[PDB]
Amino acid sequence: ITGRPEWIWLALGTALMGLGTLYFLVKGMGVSDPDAKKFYAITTLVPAIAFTMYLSMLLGYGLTMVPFGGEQNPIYWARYADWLFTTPLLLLDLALLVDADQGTILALVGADGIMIGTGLVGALTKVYSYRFVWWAISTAAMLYILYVLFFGFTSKAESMRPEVASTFKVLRNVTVVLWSAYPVVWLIGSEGAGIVPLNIETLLFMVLDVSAKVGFGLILLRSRAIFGEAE
Amino acid sequence: ITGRPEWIWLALGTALMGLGTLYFLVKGMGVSDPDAKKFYAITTLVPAIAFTMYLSMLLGYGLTMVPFGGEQNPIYWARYADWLFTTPLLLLDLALLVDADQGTILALVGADGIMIGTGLVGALTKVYSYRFVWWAISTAAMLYILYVLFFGFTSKAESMRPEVASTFKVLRNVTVVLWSAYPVVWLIGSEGAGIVPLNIETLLFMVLDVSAKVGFGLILLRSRAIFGEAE
Amino acid sequence: ITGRPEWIWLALGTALMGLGTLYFLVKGMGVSDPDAKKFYAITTLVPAIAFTMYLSMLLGYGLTMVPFGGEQNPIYWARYADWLFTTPLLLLDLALLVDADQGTILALVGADGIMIGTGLVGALTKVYSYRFVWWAISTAAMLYILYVLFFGFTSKAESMRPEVASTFKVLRNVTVVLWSAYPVVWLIGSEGAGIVPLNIETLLFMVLDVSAKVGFGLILLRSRAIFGEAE
Ligand SMILES: CC(C)CCC[C@@H](C)CCC[C@@H](C)CCC[C@@H](C)CCOC[C@@H](CO)OCC[C@H](C)CCC[C@H](C)CCC[C@H](C)CCCC(C)C
Ligand SMILES: CC(C)CCC[C@@H](C)CCC[C@@H](C)CCC[C@@H](C)CCOC[C@@H](CO)OCC[C@H](C)CCC[C@H](C)CCC[C@H](C)CCCC(C)C
Ligand SMILES: CC(C)CCC[C@@H](C)CCC[C@@H](C)CCC[C@@H](C)CCOC[C@@H](CO)OCC[C@H](C)CCC[C@H](C)CCC[C@H](C)CCCC(C)C
Ligand SMILES: *C/C=C(C)/C=C/C=C(C)/C=C/C1=C(C)CCCC1(C)C
Ligand SMILES: *C/C=C(C)/C=C/C=C(C)/C=C/C1=C(C)CCCC1(C)C
Ligand SMILES: *C/C=C(C)/C=C/C=C(C)/C=C/C1=C(C)CCCC1(C)C
Ligand SMILES: CCCCCCCCCCCCCCC
Ligand SMILES: CCCCCCCCCCCCCCC
Ligand SMILES: CCCCCCCCCCCCCCC
Ligand SMILES: CCCCCCCCCCCCCC
Ligand SMILES: CCCCCCCCCCCCCC
Ligand SMILES: CCCCCCCCCCCCCC
Ligand SMILES: CCCCCCCCCCCCC
Ligand SMILES: CCCCCCCCCCCCC
Ligand SMILES: CCCCCCCCCCCCC
Ligand SMILES: CCCCCCCCCCC
Ligand SMILES: CCCCCCCCCCC
Ligand SMILES: CCCCCCCCCCC
Ligand SMILES: CCCCCCCCCCC
Ligand SMILES: CCCCCCCCCC
Ligand SMILES: CCCCCCCCCC
Ligand SMILES: CCCCCCCCCC
Ligand SMILES: CCCCCCCCC
Ligand SMILES: CCCCCCCCC
Ligand SMILES: CCCCCCCCC
Ligand SMILES: CCCCCCCC
Ligand SMILES: CCCCCCCC
Ligand SMILES: CCCCCCCC
Ligand SMILES: CCCCCCCC
Ligand SMILES: CCCCCCCC
Ligand SMILES: CCCCCCCC
Ligand SMILES: CCCCCCCC
Ligand SMILES: CCCCCCCC
Ligand SMILES: CCCCCCCC
């Protein structure tokens, strides 16, 4: 395990996701409100899935070698397995907060699936120049998602409770900033142009992942917006 | 890319799915009705997914070699990845049109999953005679789906709005004819008996795919059946 | 096929799932009640999926070799493909019976996904001692599911119809006993410590699978709890 310099960040990531999972699990024990239960379920599952995939990367299972540029390049494929399930759960948290219509939710989840799926294909593609074609398609799917979060959701939040409108606005802003960093790190890291070494890349993704999951969850689950308006 | 004679049909397929995706995306921009949004979301996602998988076939990612009959046989596995997601979306379009009950929808999607999954296993099976066992099981799942579309849905459409009944009937008929061709092409093509060469097989699937997705979508999204009855 | 001593149990399993599938399919033909249709759909799909995966194991497709302990160890990976889809369907049968809230259903299905997914990783892991780390995480996800079935569902059933409360209690008890055997068989069988040989392991899983699917389904589909209260 320690044979890879990036192991320290995989281990820290595993620990922080594990701790985040346990914290949300305990916190949600005292919850009976049916609406709050939905948000706790979604939000606890996110770091639990990430915990398993960080562990698989730490132990070496979630790593494969991909030939491109005349080299055997270490590619952590387990990231995409994580993201396939956790990024639509994160979007679902946002969509339920603002009572999004079903068509909009399906558009978001579908675009998200395309985003992660094409990122996976790009990560595993052996023809170097083609990796960036997949990156571009994935990034276009991301831009669609960000567009919807701003010009379909923000003006939906404003007709809702003030506490859900303010909580949505904060989580929207956190999401757009954090999620936009992922394609940049991929592009300059070992999957793309290879300018930033894998150990630093792994650190960067770990900070983004913990912030986008445990950070996000801490903000959401401390808000009164997750509860039905009750006396 | 041009090293494979079937590349021209993969390229045309990619282009037509891409163009179809953009057309539906633009067309649905001016839509606020919650019901119509569902149909636009579902129907736009279908060629978008197909676009990505056609591209993966064009670039060579979605192709593998399978030993059977003492030969290395080129198998485009990306078709099944496409179909796994797009065929239940197509069925969902039909089921929502007639306000199908939840049990019926689950039966359809489940049978569809079995249909595509067993087709994939058959496509990748190395014992030649066993490929046709999987083809038979998949075809039985197809026949179940077609049965339900006729003797569970058609008489559901007739108690609904005339515009939804007439639109459903047309899309049902398009679906049954087009979908029934797929097992025949598989059986006589490079996956099955090998009587029709891969380049012609690829052409045939491209015509079926564009018709079943973009053709289907053009009929559906031009109907007033996708809108709630409103003043 | 007969080259593997466990083939007889794979063949019997295939037959019993096939027969169970046909029986439930015929039985549900005379059903119009929308609630009952849901239970028939879910419950018929379960042995149908299991039939396909038992067949893939019989024909040899669903088997791979995994190096650990200095040996090539036969691992039937198709079990996890089965279980990935059938165990959440089984939980859905239980959850719908007691009209579980959406948050609880998502927690169950999510924990179940983690349970099966980590079992799959453990089954395919090449470092022997690490296989048991994945077994432990999977078992913890199982224990969560069993906890919810007892201390979240049982007291939900009691405020419902007596026929649904009594049917739920029986199916809950069947589920907890049968499902708890699976991690034990894995641990002592060819995936784990290797004390029980593969042919006996295969027998054990076949008895558990038929009981947990066809047995379970026979109890559920003969109950009046699956019908809406109607005059
Ligand atoms: C509604 C939304 C969910 C829409 C989803 C959007 C989605 C369509 C976007 C594209 C997804 C698609 C790229 C998934 C591809 C998975 C694939 C990378 C798995 C690895 O297999 C690739 C090659 C080795 O590189 O296998 C070597 C050759 C092997 C023989 C491969 C044969 C097995 C195939 C992988 C079977 C395909 C199954 C499905 C792709 C399962 C989807 C997995 C998940 C990653 C989407
Ligand atoms: C409700 C509905 C959805 C019901 C669904 C119906 C469904 C049950 C029908 C059968 C689906 C099942 C056949 C999927 C099999 C996928 C498999 C072909 C992927 C390729 O792996 C096959 C061999 C190489 O040929 O791998 C070589 C050996 C490797 C070590 C394989 C180990 C990895 C396994 C593939 C893990 C299994 C994961 C699940 C099958 C994911 C499902 C993928 C999708 C195609 C259904
Ligand atoms: C809401 C709930 C559903 C939550 C779900 C919980 C879930 C997160 C729990 C963990 C699931 C995760 C372990 C699935 C891993 C599948 C993996 C074993 C498939 C086989 O690939 C493993 C190695 C060979 O051993 O591939 C060799 C290297 C290859 C290059 C691998 C590259 C292809 C990757 C497999 C692509 C990943 C796609 C997704 C994992 C699809 C999920 C399949 C299913 C088994 C969950
Ligand atoms: C918890 C993990 C999260 C929130 C991950 C988010 C990841 C993305 C938004 C990834 C986006 C990518 C692209 C837009 C193109 C390049 C490849 C990706 C997959 C890194
Ligand atoms: C957009 C793509 C569509 C509508 C594809 C439909 C495909 C089928 C109905 C495929 C059916 C098959 C069988 C019935 C058995 C042989 C294998 C298949 C998968 C080709
Ligand atoms: C129809 C099949 C059923 C009901 C299978 C149930 C399987 C399980 C509950 C498996 C549990 C496992 C663990 C808890 C850890 C070890 C690995 C598994 C996957 C066997
Ligand atoms: C969105 C953030 C992307 C920028 C990442 C900056 C990383 C700077 C680290 C120094 C680069 C290491 C190069 C020498 C090894
Ligand atoms: C459902 C349509 C299946 C029939 C396809 C007919 C294809 C005819 C093309 C000629 C066959 C090529 C054989 C000589 C290369
Ligand atoms: C939950 C049941 C697990 C116990 C399984 C008992 C199997 C006993 C069979 C005898 C073991 C075979 C060892 C000699 C080959
Ligand atoms: C490819 C995996 C996509 C599914 C991820 C799980 C999250 C799905 C959330 C469903 C949202 C509800 C839509 C109506
Ligand atoms: C194996 C992939 C199956 C899922 C495909 C996505 C479409 C699912 C549509 C869900 C229909 C709603 C059922 C209640
Ligand atoms: C990884 C596969 C998980 C999906 C299995 C299919 C069963 C899903 C049942 C959905 C229950 C409804 C939740 C709201
Ligand atoms: C186009 C929608 C406006 C809100 C999205 C902001 C786009 C940020 C760009 C992210 C950088 C990705 C490379
Ligand atoms: C049995 C249901 C009647 C409607 C379905 C028509 C079946 C068409 C056969 C398709 C050919 C597949 C090989
Ligand atoms: C902790 C919840 C109480 C009900 C679950 C009973 C646990 C049975 C243990 C199963 C054995 C697995 C190794
Ligand atoms: C070796 C790099 C070749 C450049 C490929 C860039 C493709 C980016 C596509 C953006 C439309
Ligand atoms: C080499 C071909 C052997 C014939 C197999 C046909 C099987 C079809 C099954 C239909 C019930
Ligand atoms: C070779 C076996 C080494 C023992 C591993 C047991 C790990 C079990 C983890 C339970 C917390
Ligand atoms: C990680 C295993 C958890 C089993 C005990 C249940 C914890 C309490 C959860 C309350 C919903
Ligand atoms: C509760 C702490 C969980 C941390 C387990 C994984 C950390 C890796 C240590 C090497
Ligand atoms: C908008 C046109 C999209 C076409 C891109 C793929 C066509 C392949 C050209 C070689
Ligand atoms: C209807 C009987 C189904 C049995 C088919 C599979 C049994 C395997 C026989 C070798
Ligand atoms: C993006 C950083 C999130 C910070 C989380 C802090 C949570 C405290 C309530
Ligand atoms: C099956 C062929 C479909 C033809 C689509 C034409 C759409 C015009 C409205
Ligand atoms: C766990 C054993 C189940 C027994 C099923 C018998 C069904 C008869 C109604
Ligand atoms: C990591 C366990 C958290 C302890 C409880 C925190 C207050 C709910
Ligand atoms: C008003 C919300 C500001 C949140 C910005 C957080 C940036 C990481
Ligand atoms: C809305 C601001 C987006 C900031 C992008 C930051 C990418 C590192
Ligand atoms: C391909 C872009 C379509 C242009 C608009 C067509 C009329 C909505
Ligand atoms: C009355 C509907 C006829 C549609 C037939 C289309 C055949 C491709
Ligand atoms: C309902 C008519 C079906 C026609 C099947 C055509 C197969 C090529
Ligand atoms: C296996 C076929 C079952 C025959 C009908 C049983 C009574 C519904
Ligand atoms: C009162 C229900 C008892 C069911 C026990 C079944 C054990 C297999
Ligand atoms: C509730 C009793 C569980 C029995 C476990 C049996 C495991 C073989």
Side-chain angles (χ1 to χ4, degrees):
Chain A
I1 274 50
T2 57
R4 292 167 274 144
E6 71 270 19
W7 80 265
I8 180 57
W9 312 124
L10 299 177
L12 195 60
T14 302
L16 291 171
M17 295 298 185
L19 269 303
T21 295
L22 291 175
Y23 182 72
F24 297 155
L25 190 74
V26 171
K27 200 181 181 295
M29 291 187 65
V31 176
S32 56
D33 175 69
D35 275 337
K37 288 206 282 192
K38 289 167 186 54
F39 291 105
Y40 269 96
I42 296 175
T43 303
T44 304
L45 274 167
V46 166
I49 290 159
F51 164 81
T52 65
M53 290 298 91
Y54 262 87
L55 181 62
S56 79
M57 286 187 286
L58 180 64
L59 304 180
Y61 184 85
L63 175 69
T64 191
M65 297 291 158
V66 179
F68 63 83
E71 308 164 12
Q72 290 294 340
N73 306 273
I75 300 293
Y76 284 100
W77 60 261
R79 301 200 188 279
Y80 305 89
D82 173 337
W83 297 348
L84 180 62
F85 298 108
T86 57
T87 52
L89 287 176
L90 286 170
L91 292 173
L92 197 57
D93 262 344
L94 290 183
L96 293 184
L97 204 49
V98 300
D99 197 28
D101 66 272
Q102 295 192 355
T104 298
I105 296 179
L106 199 87
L108 278 171
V109 173
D112 192 277
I114 290 172
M115 182 179 67
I116 303 300
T118 53
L120 176 57
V121 169
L124 293 180
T125 282
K126 300 173 182 186
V127 180
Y128 188 67
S129 65
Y130 292 169
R131 299 176 67 86
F132 301 102
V133 175
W134 295 107
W135 177 92
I137 294 163
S138 181
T139 294
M142 191 187 68
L143 287 175
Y144 176 80
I145 292 164
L146 299 187
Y147 171 82
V148 173
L149 291 187
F150 268 104
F151 302 93
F153 270 18
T154 285
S155 276
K156 177 61 186 294
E158 302 178 16
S159 62
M160 309 261 302
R161 291 149 55 183
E163 60 274 13
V164 317
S166 49
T167 296
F168 171 75
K169 179 183 64 192
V170 174
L171 288 180
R172 176 200 71 191
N173 289 350
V174 166
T175 298
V176 173
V177 169
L178 288 179
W179 284 35
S180 293
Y182 285 79
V184 178
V185 170
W186 196 104
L187 190 68
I188 68 179
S190 57
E191 290 88 1
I195 307 160
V196 170
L198 184 51
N199 70 309
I200 301 307
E201 174 188 339
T202 299
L203 170 61
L204 292 172
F205 277 138
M206 190 255 282
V207 174
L208 292 174
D209 284 347
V210 176
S211 301
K213 297 184 160 69
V214 184
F216 181 104
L218 281 174
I219 297 176
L220 178 63
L221 296 181
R222 279 175 64 268
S223 179
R224 233 91 55 183
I226 63 175
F227 289 94
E229 228 189 343
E231 192 74 40
Chain B
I1 274 50
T2 57
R4 292 167 274 144
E6 71 270 19
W7 80 265
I8 180 57
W9 312 124
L10 299 177
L12 195 60
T14 302
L16 291 171
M17 295 298 185
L19 269 303
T21 295
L22 291 175
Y23 182 72
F24 297 155
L25 190 74
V26 171
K27 200 181 181 295
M29 291 187 65
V31 176
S32 56
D33 175 69
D35 275 337
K37 288 206 282 192
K38 289 167 186 54
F39 291 105
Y40 269 96
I42 296 175
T43 303
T44 304
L45 274 167
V46 166
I49 290 159
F51 164 81
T52 65
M53 290 298 91
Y54 262 87
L55 181 62
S56 79
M57 286 187 286
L58 180 64
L59 304 180
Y61 184 85
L63 175 69
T64 191
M65 297 291 158
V66 179
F68 63 83
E71 308 164 12
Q72 290 294 340
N73 306 273
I75 300 293
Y76 284 100
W77 60 261
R79 301 200 188 279
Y80 305 89
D82 173 337
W83 297 348
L84 180 62
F85 298 108
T86 57
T87 52
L89 287 176
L90 286 170
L91 292 173
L92 197 57
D93 262 344
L94 290 183
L96 293 184
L97 204 49
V98 300
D99 197 28
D101 66 272
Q102 295 192 355
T104 298
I105 296 179
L106 199 87
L108 278 171
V109 173
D112 192 277
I114 290 172
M115 182 179 67
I116 303 300
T118 53
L120 176 57
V121 169
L124 293 180
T125 282
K126 300 173 182 186
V127 180
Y128 188 67
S129 65
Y130 292 169
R131 299 176 67 86
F132 301 102
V133 175
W134 295 107
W135 177 92
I137 294 163
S138 181
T139 294
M142 191 187 68
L143 287 175
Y144 176 80
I145 292 164
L146 299 187
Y147 171 82
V148 173
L149 291 187
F150 268 104
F151 302 93
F153 270 18
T154 285
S155 276
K156 177 61 186 294
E158 302 178 16
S159 62
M160 309 261 302
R161 291 149 55 183
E163 60 274 13
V164 317
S166 49
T167 296
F168 171 75
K169 179 183 64 192
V170 174
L171 288 180
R172 176 200 71 191
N173 289 350
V174 166
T175 298
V176 173
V177 169
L178 288 179
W179 284 35
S180 293
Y182 285 79
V184 178
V185 170
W186 196 104
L187 190 68
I188 68 179
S190 57
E191 290 88 1
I195 307 160
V196 170
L198 184 51
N199 70 309
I200 301 307
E201 174 188 339
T202 299
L203 170 61
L204 292 172
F205 277 138
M206 190 255 282
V207 174
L208 292 174
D209 284 347
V210 176
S211 301
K213 297 184 160 69
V214 184
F216 181 104
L218 281 174
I219 297 176
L220 178 63
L221 296 181
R222 279 175 64 268
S223 179
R224 233 91 55 183
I226 63 175
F227 289 94
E229 228 189 343
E231 192 74 40
Chain C
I1 274 50
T2 57
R4 292 167 274 144
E6 71 270 19
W7 80 265
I8 180 57
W9 312 124
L10 299 177
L12 195 60
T14 302
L16 291 171
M17 295 298 185
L19 269 303
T21 295
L22 291 175
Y23 182 72
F24 297 155
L25 190 74
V26 171
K27 200 181 181 295
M29 291 187 65
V31 176
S32 56
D33 175 69
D35 275 337
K37 288 206 282 192
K38 289 167 186 54
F39 291 105
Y40 269 96
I42 296 175
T43 303
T44 304
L45 274 167
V46 166
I49 290 159
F51 164 81
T52 65
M53 290 298 91
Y54 262 87
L55 181 62
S56 79
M57 286 187 286
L58 180 64
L59 304 180
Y61 184 85
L63 175 69
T64 191
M65 297 291 158
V66 179
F68 63 83
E71 308 164 12
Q72 290 294 340
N73 306 273
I75 300 293
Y76 284 100
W77 60 261
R79 301 200 188 279
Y80 305 89
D82 173 337
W83 297 348
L84 180 62
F85 298 108
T86 57
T87 52
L89 287 176
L90 286 170
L91 292 173
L92 197 57
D93 262 344
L94 290 183
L96 293 184
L97 204 49
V98 300
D99 197 28
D101 66 272
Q102 295 192 355
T104 298
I105 296 179
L106 199 87
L108 278 171
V109 173
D112 192 277
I114 290 172
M115 182 179 67
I116 303 300
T118 53
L120 176 57
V121 169
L124 293 180
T125 282
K126 300 173 182 186
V127 180
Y128 188 67
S129 65
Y130 292 169
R131 299 176 67 86
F132 301 102
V133 175
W134 295 107
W135 177 92
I137 294 163
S138 181
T139 294
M142 191 187 68
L143 287 175
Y144 176 80
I145 292 164
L146 299 187
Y147 171 82
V148 173
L149 291 187
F150 268 104
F151 302 93
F153 270 18
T154 285
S155 276
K156 177 61 186 294
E158 302 178 16
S159 62
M160 309 261 302
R161 291 149 55 183
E163 60 274 13
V164 317
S166 49
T167 296
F168 171 75
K169 179 183 64 192
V170 174
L171 288 180
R172 176 200 71 191
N173 289 350
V174 166
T175 298
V176 173
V177 169
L178 288 179
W179 284 35
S180 293
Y182 285 79
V184 178
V185 170
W186 196 104
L187 190 68
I188 68 179
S190 57
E191 290 88 1
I195 307 160
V196 170
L198 184 51
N199 70 309
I200 301 307
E201 174 188 339
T202 299
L203 170 61
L204 292 172
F205 277 138
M206 190 255 282
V207 174
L208 292 174
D209 284 347
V210 176
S211 301
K213 297 184 160 69
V214 184
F216 181 104
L218 281 174
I219 297 176
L220 178 63
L221 296 181
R222 279 175 64 268
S223 179
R224 233 91 55 183
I226 63 175
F227 289 94
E229 228 189 343
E231 192 74 40

